C-alpha cells in the first residue's frame, strides 16, 4: 500500500 | 620553317605582342633591314640584336597584402591581395591557402523539468545549464543558447484543481508556495548572450503536479517544430538537452485526462510562449518525435538523474542518434556528450569567383588533407578547426582588353575572408613612351618614329 | 448538538388506524433522518433511512416524509405487531442524536381500579420490618395517583411503586404500592389507608384496615 | 442474513472497567461503520461513537470521551466497547449498530448487552404471603411480597404455574442496592381459602427456592 | 470475407459529441436488437459538456437516435458533519457503454467528486461513475465504487495507500454472463490501476438517489501494491472476461496494463479473487501493449484464445529505421493447467501511424465454417490514413496472417474510423453476425451486414 509515487 | 611572329604583318611593336606571348621585338636601329624585328627572342639575339633593345614582357603576379593565417581579426585566406600583370593571350598562376580558424556554429536549447520532484535537483540543473553556457562558449565563440521549462498538462487529474487557492499555488496544502502549473513555457530564445542566459536560469523555481510521469515530450516536440520561436539557425549544429528526474508521459496516456486527439506534430506556441495545445492534444509518440527531430536535424540529449538513466537509455535505442548523460551535482558527464558532438563536426572549403571579366578564364588545382594535387578541383571536404588546404589558380586573358585594369575576388563559400586579384593588361612596349612626334626618317606625311620604324 | 423533539410521547390508538409520529430537528437536517422500532422486550429494527427509504423487509404500511427540520413517520392500517416504541435519529451531524420516543398503546374503554390493601405478614413482623402493600389492578387509562395515610396523616417517605405494561388480554394497567416503615412505628398506629385517584372518579377509592381487628 | 451478535449480560463494580463485544454474522465487520449506542429507561438513547474497522479510526460524543474506547478486530470479525471508571450512570443497555446501504445510517442493531454497575453482594429474597384483611365479595385478591434480593432476576409463579390467569407480577424496583418485587392473584371467593394457593419464588443467583402458602388471617 | 461494404447504414449523433466513441449491441426482453452508442462530449441541457447515450433501433436506412436519459444534475449532501459533492461537468458519460440482458451500463470515467469537512477536503478528483439503465421499465441506478470520505491529510499520513481518488472507474467495462459488472479504473491506487466488480442486481437493489456514499456488500475490488513495476501501469485501461483455468464454474478476468513496468506494458489473466494466473509482457517500450484485449476461441477447439493490441508498436526496417505501425498478438490456449506460451501469431500494421490493434472485436463465426473470426481496427490506416478495419477468419492453425477482407473508412480524415468495434450479433436476423464500427471523429457509427 505505502509508496511515494507522485511528483515528489 | 617560319614562326608566327615573323609571318603576321608586324608593322609595329604592339602588333608583335598581340600575335603570341612568345614573340619579341627588336628596337635596335643598328639591325639590318633584312632581319625581321618581330621574332622569337632566341632568333633576335642570334641576329646581333642589342640585348637592351629587345622588348619582351613577362607576365607576373605580386603579393600586395600577405598577412599570415591565424592561430589559437582572424585571417583565414592568404594572401589577401595579389596584383596580376598579363600580356596579350598570356596566362599566369598563383597560390592561395585557406584555413578553418573560426569556431563552428552550435545551438543548444535547454529544457528544464520544473516539477516539484525537481526541487532537490533544482541546483543541479541550474549548475548544468550555466556550465553548458560557460564551458561551450570556451569551446566555440559561435555558440547560441536558450531554454524552456515544462511540468505537465495542466488538467485534472495531473493538476490539483482544488481548493480554488491551489490553482495559483499548487503547494497550498503544504502551507508553502510554488509557481502555477504549466505545460511548456518557452523562456529564452537562442542567444549569444551567455551572461543573461545564466541569470534567467538561476531565477527559475519549481511548480507542482500530482503524478510522477511528466509532460517533457510535449516540450521536446514543440522545441523541435517551432523553428522561429526557438530560433535554430540553418547552417548550425542543433542540440536539444532535456532534463528530468522521473518517468515521462507517452502517446495514449492523454486519455486519462480525457484527451484522445493524436499529436499533429505542428507548432502551437505563438505569442504568450505557452504550448497552447497542451490540454486538447495527446502526448507525441516515439515515432513522431523521431520523425520531426530527423526532419529539423536536431540531436536529442537526455540529461536525466541516475534513477531513470536505464529508462531513458532504453528510449534512446528507440530514437536513433539520441544519447543519454547523467544529471547530477557534477556536469562532466553531460558536457562530454556535447564536446563529443562538437568533435564530430566537419567543414568544407569551396571556392567561388566573383566579378570575373568576360575576357578572363580560370582553372584550379586543389591540394587537400590527402596532400594530392587533384587538378581542376576548387573544393576540399572534411576539415576540422585548424586544418589548412591549398589551391593553385591559373588565369588566362583573351587577347588584349580595352579596359586595361580590372579586379575579381576568390572567396570560399561561407567565409568572410577572400582574395582580391587586381589585373593589369600590359599590351604596349616601353619604347612607345619615347614617341618622337616628328618622323625625321619617313618625311612623306607618315608621322612619328618609334622602336626603329615608320608607319 | 442537534436536538430531536419527537411527538407525541405516547398515543392510544386502535387496530386499523392510520397514525403519524412527528420529529422536529433544532436545525435543518436535509432528510438525514432514520426511524427505528423497538417492540416490547425486544431490540431495535430500522424502518426508514434517509427520510423516506424503507429498510429491506419492512412492510409497505410504514412510510416517511418531511423536509428541513420537520419529519414524520406514518403507519397506515395498524397491526397488532405495530404497538411498540418508535424513535427518530438524525445523522446530519456528529454526534448523532435521538428523539425521545413515541409509544403506541392500545385504546380501550375506561376502567376503575380494584384497590386491595394488605397488612404486614406475621413472618415480616417477626423479622423487625413492616410493609403495607396495596394493589391497584386492571384500570384504564394508565395515569393514576396513590396516597398513603397512617391515622389520617399523609405518609410520603418510604413508599415504593411499580407499574405493569399494558395487559395482553384486556389492555388494562395495574400498579403496586408498598409502604415500608419500622415495626416499632407500625405498632404505634391503628388506621392504615390506601387512596387511589383516577379519572374514572372525582373522588378517590379508599381502602383501609385497623391494626389487630378480627 | 446480516446479524450482530453481542456478548452477554454484565454485572460489574463501580470504579472497575468492562469490555462489551459485538461479532458480525453473515458479513465482515470491516464492511461498514460500526456504532455503539446507550439506552436507559429515563434518559433514552445516546450515541457513544463509531469505528471504521477497516482502518481503526474512531469518533466519539464528547460526553463519552475518556470513558469509552471503541476498537475492532477484523481477524475475529468483532467490534468492542470498553467503559472505564464505571459508575451508576453506566448502568444501561448497550447496542452495536451498522447501516444497510447509506454509509451514515443506523439500520441494523445487535440484541443489546445489559450492564449493571453495583457494589451489592448476592442476597436471597425474603418472601412474604399477603392474605386479605377482615366483608367478602364475589372475588378475592391475594399477593406475594419479595423483598431485598440481588441480583435480578427472580421467577415467581403460583401453584408451580397451575394458576397463571388473573395474575399481575410487577417489575422489580431497586431500593438501597437491593431489589423488591410483588405479585397479585385474583380468584373467585369460592376458590380460596377452600383450595390451596401457594406463592413460588426462585432466585438462581443464591440457589434458593421458597414456597409460601397464603393462609387466611386468624384471631 | 462476406461483410457487405456497399450497403452500409449510418447512424449519426450531434456535432462535437463524439457519438461513436463507444458502442454495443443491446437486446430487449422481446429479443429485438438495438445499438447502444456512447457520445462522451454531448452537451447537456445547459450547454455544458456532460456526454450522453443513445439507443438506436435497427433500420437499414439508419439516421438519428433517441437519447437514453440520465440525471446530469450535480448533487450535494451535508451528512455526518461532512459535505459530499458530485461534479458531472466534462464527465464523459458514454466514454464506455456495455449491455447485459435488459440492462445498459454507461460510464462517465471523469466524473469528479469531493468531500469537504470544515477547512479540509478529500480533493476534487475524477473517481468516475457508471449509470445503469433498464429501458423497458425506466429504472435507473448508479455505481461509483471509488468515492470516499477520507480527507487529504489522512492519505498523506498513510503514504497514499488505498488512494482511490483518481480511479476513473468505468474507463473500461465488461459484464460476465452471470451478471457481474467489472469496471476498469486505471487511475486507481495512485495510477497503478484497479478493478471493481459487483453484481448488476445488487447495484440496483442498493441504490437510492441522493445518498452518494453507499454500500454494495457483494462488491469486490482489486488490491494496492508497493511494487514499482506496477506504478503508473494503468492496470484496467482495458478489461475482458473468459475461461482460462478449465473450470466452467469460475470466471477469469483479462486486464490490460499498457504502461506496466516503465512503459513495457502488460496484460494479466486473473481469477475472480484477483489472483494472477498468467502475465503476458510487452515486446517494446511505449508500444501500448494492452491498449486492447479480446477473448475468443479462433481455432475451434472450444478453448478461449487471447488477443492483445499494441497500437504504437514500431516495426524494424532497412538501415536500422523504425516505423510506428502497431501490432496484434494472438495467444492460443493449450490443454490442461499449462500456461499461455509465446504468441502463436503476430499481426503487424502496414500504414505509418495507422495504430493497427487499437481495437480488436470478436466477430463470432462470420462465414459459418466452424471457426470464429475477428476484426482489427487501424483508425488511421489505409493509404490516405482515413481509417481501416481488417477481418481475419479463424482456422485450425489459429488465424490467417492475410486478412480475408478490408473495410476502408467512408468518413473524412480524423474520423477515427474503427476506434470502437463490436460484433458477434445478428442485427437483421439473416443468420449471420454483423459488425458495428464507430467513427467518433465524424460523430457517426457504420453498420456492416454479413451476407451469404
Ligand atoms: C595542375 O596540376 C597539373 C599537374 O601537375 C599541372 O599540369 C602541368 O601544366 C603545364 C601547363 O599548364 C604543363 O606544361 C606543358 O607541358 C608540355 C609537355 O609536357 C610533357 O612532359 C612532361 C615531362 O615529361 C617527363 O617527365 C615526367 C616526370 O616528371 C614523365 O612523366 C615523362 O615520362 C617524362 O620523363 C610530362 O609531365 C607531361 O605529362 C603530362 O601531359 C601528358 C600530355 O597530355 C599527359 O598525358 C600526362 O598524363 C601528363 O599529365 C608531358 O608528357 C609542353 O609541351 C607544353 O608546352 C607547350 O605550351 C607552352 C605554353 O603553354 C609553350 O611554352 C611551349 O612552347 C609548348 O607549345 C607545356 O609546357 C605540364 O606538362 C603539366 N604537367 C603535368 C604533370 O600534367 C597544371 O599546371 C596545374 N594547374 C594549375 C592551375 O596549377
Ligand atoms: C531497459 O531495457 C533493459 C534491456 O531490455 C531491461 O533489462 C532487462 O530486463 C529484463 C526483464 O524485462 C531481464 O530479463 C530477465 O533476465 C533474467 C536472466 O538474465 C540473465 O542474462 C542477462 C543477459 O543479458 C544478464 O544481463 C542478466 O544479468 C542475467 O544474468 C531472467 O532470469 C528473467 O526471467 C524471469 O522473468 C521473466 C519475465 O520476463 C520470466 O519469463 C522468467 O520465467 C523469469 O521468471 C528475465 O528474462 C534482463 O535481465 C534485462 N536485460 C539486461 C541486458 O540487463 C531493463 O529492465 C529496462 N529498464 C527500463 C527502466 O525500462
Ligand atoms: C606555376 O607555373 C609556373 C610556370 O611558369 C611554374 O614555374 C611554377 O612552379 C608554378 N607556380 C605556382 C605558384 O603555382
Ligand atoms: C457540423 O459542423 C459543420 C461545420 O463545422 C457544419 O457544416 C454542419 O452543418 C454541422 N453538422 C450538423 C448536423 O449540423
Ligand atoms: C460452484 O462452486 C461454488 C463454491 O465455490 C458453489 O457454491 C456453487 O454452487 C457452484 N456452482 C455450480 C453451478 O455448481
Ligand atoms: Ca528529485
Ligand atoms: Ca505529472
Ligand atoms: Ca474458470
Ligand atoms: Ca482455441
Ligand atoms: Ca469463420
Ligand atoms: Ca446479419
Ligand atoms: Mg516531477
XYZ file of C-alpha atoms in Angstrom, chain D:
219
model
C -28.704 -12.813 6.800
C -26.832 -9.915 8.438
C -26.817 -10.265 12.220
C -24.905 -8.573 15.061
C -24.253 -10.915 17.988
C -23.376 -9.102 21.236
C -21.772 -10.568 24.358
C -23.778 -11.471 27.454
C -25.082 -9.514 30.448
C -22.523 -7.886 32.743
C -22.619 -7.431 36.499
C -19.679 -5.136 37.295
C -18.435 -2.985 40.171
C -18.174 0.806 40.374
C -14.674 2.100 39.562
C -13.837 -1.009 37.515
C -13.886 -1.479 33.740
C -15.922 -3.658 31.391
C -15.476 -4.553 27.695
C -18.533 -5.430 25.623
C -18.220 -7.258 22.308
C -20.201 -7.421 19.074
C -19.442 -10.087 16.437
C -20.542 -9.978 12.797
C -22.518 -12.896 11.401
C -23.236 -13.205 7.681
C -20.904 -10.294 6.857
C -17.440 -8.852 7.556
C -17.066 -6.231 10.276
C -14.820 -4.020 8.077
C -17.711 -3.608 5.592
C -19.180 -0.504 7.253
C -19.029 1.926 10.176
C -19.914 0.226 13.440
C -21.541 2.398 16.110
C -22.315 1.945 19.809
C -25.456 3.294 21.492
C -26.587 3.569 25.122
C -30.215 3.120 26.223
C -31.720 3.862 29.617
C -35.365 3.918 30.704
C -35.498 7.641 31.580
C -32.632 9.284 29.690
C -33.300 7.330 26.479
C -30.959 6.659 23.560
C -27.479 8.223 23.457
C -24.887 7.800 20.695
C -21.462 6.897 22.113
C -19.266 6.739 19.000
C -18.217 4.770 15.922
C -15.289 2.890 14.421
C -14.301 2.225 10.808
C -12.959 -1.288 11.410
C -11.053 -1.290 8.099
C -8.608 1.360 9.419
C -9.405 1.736 13.143
C -10.355 5.450 13.030
C -12.989 6.478 15.595
C -15.343 9.329 16.579
C -16.949 9.957 19.989
C -19.531 12.197 21.600
C -17.525 14.454 23.983
C -19.845 13.211 26.757
C -18.099 9.805 26.490
C -14.574 10.947 25.564
C -12.291 9.392 28.184
C -14.805 6.820 29.423
C -15.473 4.967 26.143
C -12.929 3.234 23.893
C -14.226 1.582 20.722
C -11.966 -0.949 18.996
C -12.372 -3.634 16.359
C -10.583 -6.735 15.151
C -11.091 -7.932 11.584
C -9.317 -11.211 12.453
C -12.234 -12.222 14.691
C -14.892 -10.129 12.919
C -15.603 -8.402 16.236
C -16.064 -4.839 17.492
C -15.548 -3.880 21.163
C -16.726 -1.150 23.547
C -14.693 -0.622 26.719
C -16.033 1.500 29.565
C -13.538 2.673 32.199
C -14.233 4.155 35.626
C -17.706 2.599 35.852
C -20.441 4.480 37.738
C -24.180 4.179 38.381
C -24.787 6.245 35.210
C -23.241 3.440 33.110
C -25.999 1.029 34.186
C -27.751 0.706 30.822
C -28.327 -1.483 27.759
C -25.608 -1.117 25.080
C -26.122 -1.724 21.348
C -23.763 -2.023 18.388
C -25.204 -0.725 15.115
C -24.473 -0.589 11.388
C -26.099 0.818 8.235
C -27.740 -1.253 5.484
C -26.804 0.854 2.408
C -26.320 4.513 3.304
C -22.793 4.988 4.752
C -24.160 7.158 7.555
C -27.383 5.346 8.537
C -28.272 3.313 11.652
C -30.284 0.381 10.321
C -29.089 -2.967 11.758
C -28.851 -3.422 15.560
C -27.490 -6.072 17.899
C -29.742 -7.620 20.551
C -28.141 -5.376 23.197
C -25.817 -6.048 26.134
C -27.031 -5.240 29.650
C -24.533 -3.729 32.099
C -25.364 -3.416 35.798
C -22.919 -1.377 37.914
C -23.313 -2.265 41.614
C -21.443 -2.791 44.906
C -24.233 -5.006 46.260
C -23.362 -8.537 47.362
C -25.545 -11.547 46.490
C -28.611 -11.740 48.733
C -31.501 -14.232 48.815
C -35.025 -12.768 48.908
C -37.368 -12.713 51.875
C -40.783 -13.913 50.673
C -43.987 -12.919 52.449
C -47.543 -14.159 51.881
C -50.212 -11.441 51.614
C -53.634 -12.601 52.823
C -56.612 -10.199 52.824
C -57.995 -8.274 55.803
C -61.310 -8.949 57.623
C -66.896 -8.263 54.355
C -66.315 -10.708 51.472
C -67.494 -10.064 47.872
C -67.648 -12.157 44.687
C -63.875 -12.294 44.083
C -60.868 -12.300 46.414
C -57.330 -10.982 45.755
C -54.136 -12.404 47.280
C -50.464 -11.448 46.939
C -46.791 -12.174 47.469
C -44.081 -9.719 48.512
C -40.468 -10.474 47.575
C -38.002 -8.201 49.395
C -34.285 -7.487 49.486
C -32.650 -9.657 46.835
C -29.715 -9.167 44.494
C -29.092 -9.524 41.656
C -32.010 -9.862 39.254
C -33.940 -11.971 38.329
C -36.351 -13.955 40.465
C -39.034 -16.154 38.901
C -42.366 -16.079 40.731
C -45.242 -18.486 39.981
C -48.464 -19.644 41.665
C -49.141 -23.335 42.382
C -45.978 -24.016 40.334
C -47.590 -22.385 37.265
C -51.036 -24.012 37.608
C -52.571 -20.583 38.368
C -51.465 -18.164 35.625
C -54.714 -16.352 34.772
C -55.679 -13.317 36.873
C -52.069 -12.638 37.903
C -50.102 -9.377 37.970
C -46.375 -9.773 38.703
C -44.882 -6.308 38.884
C -41.424 -5.316 37.650
C -38.697 -5.260 40.307
C -37.750 -1.892 41.770
C -34.420 -1.040 43.372
C -34.053 0.442 46.865
C -30.787 0.715 48.827
C -28.925 -1.590 46.400
C -31.445 -4.480 46.725
C -34.444 -5.398 44.575
C -38.069 -5.708 45.643
C -40.851 -7.271 43.623
C -44.501 -8.153 44.226
C -47.278 -10.157 42.605
C -51.066 -10.319 42.956
C -53.534 -13.075 42.057
C -57.329 -12.782 41.887
C -59.801 -15.680 42.022
C -63.488 -16.178 42.836
C -64.315 -16.277 46.574
C -65.454 -19.923 46.284
C -61.894 -20.863 45.186
C -59.978 -19.595 48.218
C -59.350 -20.480 51.019
C -61.186 -23.757 50.196
C -58.400 -24.602 47.723
C -54.701 -24.076 48.440
C -52.836 -21.182 46.752
C -49.043 -21.123 47.168
C -46.513 -18.494 46.063
C -43.323 -19.913 44.436
C -40.201 -17.689 44.359
C -36.866 -18.820 42.840
C -33.610 -16.813 42.978
C -30.972 -18.760 40.970
C -28.143 -16.379 41.981
C -28.407 -17.547 45.625
C -29.510 -21.115 44.728
C -32.798 -20.608 46.632
C -36.373 -21.831 46.067
C -39.098 -20.802 48.513
C -42.802 -21.740 48.627
C -45.335 -19.723 50.657
C -48.933 -20.870 51.147
C -51.307 -17.902 51.541
C -53.178 -18.574 54.806
C -56.277 -16.657 55.993
C -55.701 -14.285 58.917
C -56.904 -15.649 62.265
C -57.908 -14.106 65.622
